[PDB]
């Protein structure tokens, strides 16, 4: 029986949506998520934000959503480019579902701070 | 025609086998167990007459109006597959018979008095076709699935909730402490029990205050948006609106209502209020089993699902599929589709007797609850998909390490199942291995899996 | 008194055959058709638990409160005269469990979820004892029989009414004409059908207006108070 | 029964020695000092008749209703232990005689006119049994002890307060300065005097503003929640509600009302308002001694305690036991129990003539005040226990070093007494050594103990 | 001038035998029965201090204000004629101590806590001098005697009323029937009993409706204006105002309130409402005997009379003189003068210790009630004069021929007494012959005189 | 006659409820308080929080309340474990009264900051 170990002062207590309660995604896990987004026909997109502003509804869009993009490697290189340009920012991978007009998927693939 | 006083049979006027339903007609399917000696057509015509414009004896005022138009009519009879004591009767009602935007009126007309009619031994309303013209007169869900996901900033997974237990007996501060632990553990929502309204041991204003304190602390701690369905079910509409207004005043994102026991009038008013005030509406289906359990008498839950979607709700309890028969499994999938989809095609295997067009009316989250725990995560994720709320009341509070650990275990199980599903793993077939691999990194999940037995 | 996680039976806590109902308890009589193999006491205790404070697995928050007081308890089981597939379960609920003056709350608590519980094949709520202490928190009839007779000035006989037919399809003026003829003939009341609320063929304000026109004419003609 | 005009005795109708009180009856005990020559039964029946349905001469309208049911009846007479000039009469009233949820109505019926009846030399209402059925129709305390402790986040000790002195004459800013010094010293509460409503030298809005400024500063300085009972007693209910609304607007956690001089109607309305608006309600018992001091005429304070609990109050001044006789001490303990407990058994030694069931209606804090200082801390802690408010008006402002030091001295004395009690020390027996050991570490407490003499 | 902590005597500061009261001072006379060993000046100074600005120990905040101005001071001590265990203390309070237009505040200040002070065995507030400057801040009677007579179009005689009996138990329609019979018999008013508010057997709205039906029928039948004091005494001010508003809506000319049990706050609010809405206000003095009966402890009814006149009422129950002692007769005449006159001179024989100036504030009707019948008509007419309401509850309903005959008998007796008084007959000396000559023409009066015994 | 010595800037001015105006409790005083809680039949519990958040209604629960626990040494060791795990936090000992549904006792036994 152990204490849960979450607190207001512990910065590791902050979570960032889907898959933030799992171990940080490696390259193989990120690629499988990109493949899932493409398989659904969703439009991949990359957003990023400073960790202090992660609660905001709107993160910074990295360029434009890669509409109609099915090349997994191209999506991965865009996410990596955003990570290099903003190494201290959380980087989110998004699959836009234009038919439901929702984000079919959203997950932080590069954790900041 | 002319006025001739006296009793006449319902069959000659209210049974029209050649009638073609209009696109604006409300259609109803009744499983009829008729009284012995009563022919099928007579029973169907009696149901149609008593539900629309009929009367037990001829009245002269009938001739002041055009009941060739206004009457409801039975237009088809089918055999129930299997059981031969009952039959399906299909009845069409002109849209003019009903007040616009009133599920109360349509419900009262359909189920008001025919269930006690002597000509039938038993009667079950199986399905109702609401024409799109009538659907567009109803407010529908205040926000719907997509708007709710945008408000909560939660995507790509089912939401996780938890009813605070014990159902009654906790003080407001202890209640809020339980809420805080659950929410900080990783749950999106906590929930008032259906019978938590305002009790001497916990008055509603105190519960609202301490719940909001818990929500604020958990949101600051986790950085994720949190909510708690504050139950506004109240003795009177004035009290219900007062509690809803206070929930809005203190910043509560979501409230809850028992739409059957509170009633459709109060629920529709509350749904419109929620639309006007930007508050999410979780609908609890208390008393549903009184109506929908008996397979030969009552109202099937798919009808209640359609009624709730029209009346308004952002979430609706749809029950858990685990432990249900094959026909019950299919019926549950059908009414989940009715709750969430824009268009649901006729599917007799699912008990869907009519195509249901919802147009642009948004769907509501399907809510799974009742005796579920981590071992149910795969099946749930497979059955309900992303647009659902999975509620673990006992499965969270009953964790050996408390609410925060149980919430974390449920969240880890859900996220592991979702990631495995996205990777292409067959989650329902191999849920044990996905959960075990997840538990390798989550002690909370490991001990949760040890706490409750495996389900297969 | 100590927290032990896991699933436990409802019978040991929610079945109290020696419990004597208090004068303030809400009492319920359930006709239980139990699932085969489930003992009667377990079925009765399950109904008591799920309707008041029970949960399918032990929760630690129970120990923050006095479960021995707040719980509903089955205190008696009787055989249904005739039918042997079912039995009567008598369950007592402390008055503290319910919001005062709220039939919504009491009704939700009693029938909210036990009717779908797996341990029972079928369930019928036969009777509920509302203690006088709870009755006095409810508004009750706005007027009641004696006040209504005084308002209507009608004594010594049942009142006579009539629902206007056809249930739907009449215009407001034709509706009012039917109301007037009934009331002038000797009826005390006429009645809207249950599904007459406000239809395209007769909007409610028009129906209300012509009904009152009918009531006034009938009252002047007969000299007796009329209503609809 | 027929109509016969003329005067008849009350004994034959309103004296029923064989009547068994119903569980829903309101029971009253009257200590009657009868007029010489009047038999005891006649006096008791006269009290019953004049208090319920009686009239000095027979009226025919009695026969339009069921007097056998509606009448109040004397059912028992006992001797007063000691004094033989008076006797106890027990009278039962059917619950139907009273408006539900109206302490105003019950009070008016019981004490409205019988105290001036010529058949009795003197009359004292000793006790009233409110049946649980009637209790549940009353709002009761807006929050009660447990809810208040949760709101204030204060546990395990009595709360500490202080009335600002002088009772009148301070400007709003000077008043707020005194409040700030008291609160920063360690007191939980400060208090408006009962006659501080809105005076030319300090208008109420200014007092409210500067009190809130003081409360905010003290809370920020100490990190503990603070309050000040803002007196909303006002000439009219509109003014009272205006002052309460402003107190809510500026964030005041607690307000105060004089429920006897302001009146039961205003007090009940204010208690319901406090429940609706989440504001604690402190009740001052100004004028109580006009009613309850005389042992042979008036209304015993235990009746007023029951009335206040039903009408609504989170605190109630109950007086200090210090310097009282054993009978007075026992009576005080009895009415403290009536104020705070869920069930109070009959106890003739305490003057409790009836079992009083409160059901789930919460209790109120018992407030001790009046000429008390640090030397009284042991006795108070022993007598009142944790669920009390100890008010030191002069005992705080009369400290030689000012309000902050006096507040600190009172707080240290209270905490030392509480810790010693928790350790098992007999606090009332050896309070001097507990206080001295505490004062070894608190100069404020030491000089406070020097300021006022030991009491024994 | 300097701060010295510790307890000091009240005599040196709050006893000023050379003080001359200002024209704006509120003056109070207290009959003090002091605790043995306490000197008279100390007791008087203690009363002054505890009632105005005093505290049991010196507080430094006193030096932030001008205590020499704000304090109440005892300026005179006199011997009580007869009794030597008590003495009269005269205390002056500056007008600044009180909220303007607040009898609640003045009452709370004067009687709030001094009656329980240990330095006195007993305490009775005998009289209070309200300066004209304070009187003009109070609303006073909503209409007063002259305005009420103009509204009712009734001149040259006392008004006649009747409380409907039994006090409780009648249904609304039977209640209204009794009201109608009384009013058609010749009474000006009928009256709700003090405890008739809204009972399960007669809800207030029904009573109001049927009373108005009775009033309309009686007014049409007799051609004279009629009224019924509808009791608006209610659990809360909101309920009281709701009942008053409904009474205004249905055209009720007069309502009733129990100003002591309902409370001074509610009563003042209701009096202002009555002024704003043109509704007469009848004040019932239920519970007065709890305060005013004991000659050594409590508040004399003349103080309550002044308080009611300031708070507001068009009628006030003043009691019947018949059967009272000579001192009680004089005291009753004194407080009737206080209720009705523009200026009342000091008169020690009447217990009037101060000149009371009312300025232009109108007087209220004095109401006589309680066990009176036709034989009391002469004395009443002699004692109360024209500006009074004589209420015959039992004396009307207890008539052998019913309410209408009893009302006619009372009206004939009153008019015969008034005509004989106008003719110069000594009515109280020869009331029997006046009544007999009247009864020669009134069978109702004759049998009424036979029903109840002659009174001397 | 001395100044009271309390100010907004002086962090020692902050108080933390019952017994915070007494000297900091030593081991024997803490044990006596635990014994009192047990003797009352109350359920012992440990909470803790960062000193800046001490005003909050909800502190962090250290594991679960020790329901039905009457071993004073076990309660003391749980409190000590909470103190060691969070040395900078205030540690509060609580006796839950389940019959009144209140905290029968609450006191900071370990002062942080």
Short mmCIF file of N, CA and C in Angstrom, two decimals, chain B residues 204 208 232 239-249 255 270 273 279:
data_model
loop_
_atom_site.label_atom_id
_atom_site.label_comp_id
_atom_site.label_asym_id
_atom_site.label_seq_id
_atom_site.Cartn_x
_atom_site.Cartn_y
_atom_site.Cartn_z
N UNK B 204 -27.38 20.19 -0.64
CA UNK B 204 -26.86 20.25 -1.99
C UNK B 204 -25.86 21.39 -2.16
N UNK B 208 -22.12 20.96 -3.64
CA UNK B 208 -21.65 21.69 -4.82
C UNK B 208 -20.37 22.44 -4.51
N UNK B 232 -28.84 17.78 -10.18
CA UNK B 232 -29.79 18.85 -9.95
C UNK B 232 -31.22 18.32 -9.89
N UNK B 239 -36.70 24.35 -7.92
CA UNK B 239 -35.53 23.87 -7.20
C UNK B 239 -34.47 23.33 -8.14
N UNK B 240 -34.89 22.60 -9.18
CA UNK B 240 -33.95 22.09 -10.17
C UNK B 240 -33.19 23.22 -10.84
N UNK B 241 -33.91 24.26 -11.26
CA UNK B 241 -33.26 25.39 -11.91
C UNK B 241 -32.39 26.16 -10.94
N UNK B 242 -32.80 26.26 -9.68
CA UNK B 242 -31.95 26.91 -8.68
C UNK B 242 -30.63 26.18 -8.53
N UNK B 243 -30.67 24.85 -8.44
CA UNK B 243 -29.44 24.09 -8.30
C UNK B 243 -28.59 24.18 -9.56
N UNK B 244 -29.22 24.15 -10.73
CA UNK B 244 -28.47 24.32 -11.98
C UNK B 244 -27.82 25.70 -12.04
N UNK B 245 -28.55 26.73 -11.63
CA UNK B 245 -28.01 28.09 -11.64
C UNK B 245 -26.83 28.21 -10.69
N UNK B 246 -26.92 27.59 -9.52
CA UNK B 246 -25.79 27.64 -8.60
C UNK B 246 -24.59 26.89 -9.17
N UNK B 247 -24.84 25.74 -9.81
CA UNK B 247 -23.74 25.02 -10.44
C UNK B 247 -23.06 25.87 -11.49
N UNK B 248 -23.84 26.59 -12.29
CA UNK B 248 -23.27 27.52 -13.26
C UNK B 248 -22.50 28.63 -12.56
N UNK B 249 -23.04 29.15 -11.46
CA UNK B 249 -22.42 30.26 -10.75
C UNK B 249 -21.05 29.89 -10.23
N UNK B 255 -23.67 19.07 -15.24
CA UNK B 255 -24.66 18.69 -14.25
C UNK B 255 -25.33 17.41 -14.71
N UNK B 270 -34.51 21.46 -18.63
CA UNK B 270 -33.12 21.52 -18.19
C UNK B 270 -32.16 21.45 -19.37
N UNK B 273 -32.12 24.79 -20.84
CA UNK B 273 -31.35 25.65 -19.95
C UNK B 273 -29.86 25.42 -20.12
N UNK B 279 -23.71 24.55 -20.10
CA UNK B 279 -23.39 23.53 -19.10
C UNK B 279 -23.71 22.17 -19.70
#
